[PDB]
Amino acid sequence: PPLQAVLVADSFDRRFFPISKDQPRVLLPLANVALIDYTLEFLTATGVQETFVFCCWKAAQIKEHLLKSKWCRPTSLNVVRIITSELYRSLGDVLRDVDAKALVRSDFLLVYGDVISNINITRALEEHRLRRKLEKNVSVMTMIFKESSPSHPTRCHEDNVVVAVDSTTNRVLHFQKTQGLRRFAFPLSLFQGSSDGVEVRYDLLDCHISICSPQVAQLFTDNFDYQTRDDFVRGLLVNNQIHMHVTAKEYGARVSNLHMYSAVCADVIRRWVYPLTPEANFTDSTTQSCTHSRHNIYRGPEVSLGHGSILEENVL
Amino acid sequence: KELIEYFKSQMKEDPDMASAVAAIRTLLEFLKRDKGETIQGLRANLTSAIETLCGVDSSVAVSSGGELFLRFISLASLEYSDYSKCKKIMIERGELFLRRISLSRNKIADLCHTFIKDGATILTHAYSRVVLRVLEAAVAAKKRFSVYVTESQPDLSGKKMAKALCHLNVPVTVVLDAAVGYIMEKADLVIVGAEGVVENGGIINKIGTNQMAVCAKAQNKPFYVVAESFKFVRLFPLNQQDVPDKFKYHPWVDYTAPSLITLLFTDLGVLTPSAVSDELIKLYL
């Protein structure tokens, strides 16, 4: 079964409200390079063979940038497909449309067009498939989380979440955000069947990378008021099972607002997303070449640096 | 005579040009004058001219160029043992050799200017066209660095080097001959020209070079040397006394061991202190 993914190149939320008027969120230059480029590179590096790109807001620019990019070349192993429509208003409509077109067949990945990560999903996907073959239509989704510290700059309050998972076999029993809230509530349903390996996790970074199944889209068609992924998970947890996968030696993060933007930028320049760095030039472009020097100082061609100026830290 | 006058004329149209290249040009030009058709007459007349030229100019480079010309004539003699077409073929080969030796300086600069980094401090002893060309090519490569030149008390040539460097918009600085150890810690690398390369790898340079090399060895400072191929001489001084007195004459030159040299930048390529011995063995000069 060839690995296939779905790329939502439009985030139906407007936090970059000034900047997103003239130019989409997913083409904002992070390190002289768009975010959709990061996401496509991650998908191509993790083993994805086919992607379905959905765009509603300023789709013409998105498509003509992808069409100049290296992933649409006949020499690319990740064949991309652009599906454009002006009706889409949220992720639920996109998944409904996928179910209507019957594009996906097997375990597919659900990622946003502004996700920067170097995580390999072979392990989590393998775990997912084995679990699905012991429970044929149980185990329907797998959310990838990066274990971090609650002090880290990358953990913004708008995306901050708290989970109540099983420690014996990773399984989500409770999932909720912590945006503007000081004391958390966990229902008693969690302690119902086994009651011994239960644990609360607050050290997790939501990478917004989810290993979904066609049945997920099926349920999205079933429940009409699923507008996002979070609501899908809550409505399935009030009631199929959803699991997780935690990573500790890989990087992954989604640019949701400006504060998240300045956090991934700093991480990428400081080589935290290796191999994805400006020195590598992972886009195969000629106007994005650079040279990595001491103190993580990146210099391109024709920099024309004047006498007296001092580059002291990680600059590009 | 004409040998003295021709040598001084070639030295005077362009001051820049070194003495050994001018001597080789004079020798080849006097080769056109030769009327004798016996090989020892050509050999002795030319050898007389090279010794007289060396007497006029007490430098290791002139002697090196003369030795190289005689070895090249000896090879062109092992051609056929003819001296009938030998003089002709020899003249053509000599013209080719002169044009090839002309580009030596540019080749050395283009090959050595890459070892200089932006923001680094360079330490030079005395004025030299080769180090000047290297520095001019480095600043031509959009690089910025600082240079420290020794005043060279025997003859105030370090000030001339500093003037020629400051003219290229580089922050040059002149230090005292006795201050080579005070500014050794504030230098990232050392690049100097060599008047003559000895058989083992050492160099015969201005009197104030061996002590600088010693300080560089005492502080693990890269000591680079730039010299052409016509400066290779078959000498093997064991100490400061084994050097011939005709080259020293308050001596004007000293010998530096190869153990204190890091690399060598010559027209034949970037070499180590031991590869020059292999080259000299291959020539059998």
From Swiss-Prot, chain A:
The residue ranges crossing the membrane are none
GO BP annotations listed: astrocyte development; astrocyte differentiation; cytoplasmic translational initiation; hippocampus development; myelination; oligodendrocyte development; ovarian follicle development; positive regulation of apoptotic process
Indicate the span of the full protein covered: 41 to 361 of 721
**Role this protein plays:** Acts as a component of the translation initiation factor 2B (eIF2B) complex, which catalyzes the exchange of GDP for GTP on eukaryotic initiation factor 2 (eIF2) gamma subunit. Its guanine nucleotide exchange factor activity is repressed when bound to eIF2 complex phosphorylated on the alpha subunit, thereby limiting the amount of methionyl-initiator methionine tRNA available to the ribosome and consequently global translation is repressed.
Q: How is it modified after translation?
A: Phosphorylated on serine and threonine residues by GSK3B; phosphorylation inhibits its function.
User: What keywords would UniProt list here?
Assistant: Acetylation, Cytoplasm, Disease variant, Initiation factor, Isopeptide bond, Leukodystrophy, Methylation, Phosphoprotein, Protein biosynthesis, Ubl conjugation
The annotated crosslink position for Glycyl lysine isopeptide (Lys-Gly) (interchain with G-Cter in ubiquitin) is 21, 63, 101, 177
Q: Key word Nucleus present in the record?
A: no
Name used for this protein in its record: Translation initiation factor eIF2B subunit epsilon
Assembly mode: Component of the translation initiation factor 2B (eIF2B) complex which is a heterodecamer of two sets of five different subunits: alpha, beta, gamma, delta and epsilon. Subunits alpha, beta and delta comprise a regulatory subcomplex and subunits epsilon and gamma comprise a catalytic subcomplex. Within the complex, the hexameric regulatory complex resides at the center, with the two heterodimeric catalytic subcomplexes bound on opposite sides.
* Subcellular location(s) of the protein: Cytoplasm, Cytosol
Disease note: Leukoencephalopathy with vanishing white matter 5: An autosomal recessive brain disease characterized by neurological features including progressive cerebellar ataxia, spasticity, and cognitive deficits. Brain imaging shows abnormal white matter that vanishes over time and is replaced by cerebrospinal fluid. Disease severity ranges from fatal infantile forms to adult forms without neurological deterioration. The disease is progressive with, in most individuals, additional episodes of rapid deterioration following febrile infections or minor head trauma.
- What's a GO cellular component annotated to this UniProt protein? nucleus
Cite the GO molecular-function annotations of the record. Answer: guanyl-nucleotide exchange factor activity; translation initiation factor activity; translation initiation factor binding
Please tell me, according to the UniProt entry, what happens when changing residue 155 to H. In VWM5; Cree leukoencephalopathy type
- Species of provenance: Homo sapiens
Q: Which residues carry this modification: Phosphothreonine?
A: 277
- Protein family: Belongs to the eIF-2B gamma/epsilon subunits family.
Curated annotation (Swiss-Prot), chain B:
Superkingdom of the source? Eukaryota
For whether the record's keyword set contains Acetylation, the answer is yes
| Record GO terms (molecular function) | guanyl-nucleotide exchange factor activity; identical protein binding; translation initiation factor activity
Among InterPro entries, the record links this protein to: eIF2B_alpha/beta/delta, elF-2B_alpha_N, IF-2B-related, IF_2B-like_C, NagB/RpiA_transferase-like
What name does this protein carry?
A: Translation initiation factor eIF2B subunit alpha
Q: Which compartment or compartments is the protein found in?
A: Cytoplasm, Cytosol
SUPFAM superfamilies with a match to the protein in the record: NagB/RpiA/CoA transferase-like
| GO process terms (BP) | cytoplasmic translational initiation; oligodendrocyte development; response to glucose; response to heat; response to peptide hormone; T cell receptor signaling pathway; translational initiation
| Summary of the function given for this chain in its UniProt record | Acts as a component of the translation initiation factor 2B (eIF2B) complex, which catalyzes the exchange of GDP for GTP on eukaryotic initiation factor 2 (eIF2) gamma subunit. Its guanine nucleotide exchange factor activity is repressed when bound to eIF2 complex phosphorylated on the alpha subunit, thereby limiting the amount of methionyl-initiator methionine tRNA available to the ribosome and consequently global translation is repressed.
Instruction: Report the disease annotation for this entry.
Output: Leukoencephalopathy with vanishing white matter 1: An autosomal recessive brain disease characterized by neurological features including progressive cerebellar ataxia, spasticity, and cognitive deficits. Brain imaging shows abnormal white matter that vanishes over time and is replaced by cerebrospinal fluid. Disease severity ranges from fatal infantile forms to adult forms without neurological deterioration. The disease is progressive with, in most individuals, additional episodes of rapid deterioration following febrile infections or minor head trauma.
What does the subunit section of this Swiss-Prot or TrEMBL entry state? Component of the translation initiation factor 2B (eIF2B) complex which is a heterodecamer of two sets of five different subunits: alpha, beta, gamma, delta and epsilon. Subunits alpha, beta and delta comprise a regulatory subcomplex and subunits epsilon and gamma comprise a catalytic subcomplex. Within the complex, the hexameric regulatory complex resides at the center, with the two heterodimeric catalytic subcomplexes bound on opposite sides.
Q: How is its activity regulated?
A: Activated by the chemical integrated stress response (ISR) inhibitor ISRIB which stimulates guanine nucleotide exchange factor activity for both phosphorylated and unphosphorylated eIF2.
Task: Tell me where it mainly resides.
Answer: cytoplasm
State the Gene3D superfamilies in the record: Translation initiation factor eif-2b, domain 2 (3.40.50.10470), Translation initiation factor eIF-2B, N-terminal domain (1.20.120.1070)
- What keywords are annotated for this sequence in UniProt? Acetylation, Cytoplasm, Disease variant, Initiation factor, Leukodystrophy, Protein biosynthesis
User: Where, per the database record, does this protein carry N6-acetyllysine?
Assistant: 32
> Which Gene Ontology cellular-component terms appear in the entry?
cytoplasm; cytosol; eukaryotic translation initiation factor 2B complex; membrane; plasma membrane
Cited Pfam families:
IF-2B (PF01008)
